[PDB]
Amino acid sequence: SGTLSTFFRLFNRSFTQA
């Protein structure tokens, strides 16, 4: 479920870099 964890990991990582 959850998910949300992963989605938040890719969203934060992508926002930080790029």
Q: What is the DSSP string of 6-18?
A: HHHHHHHHHHHH-
Q: Which pair of tokens denotes residue 15? A: 């926002």
Whole-angstrom CA distances from 9 to 2, 17 are: 12, 12
**What region, left, alpha or beta, does residue 17 occupy, with left being phi > 0 and alpha being psi -120 to 50 degrees?**
alpha
Elucidation method:
NMR
Residue the block writes with tokens 């949300």: 4
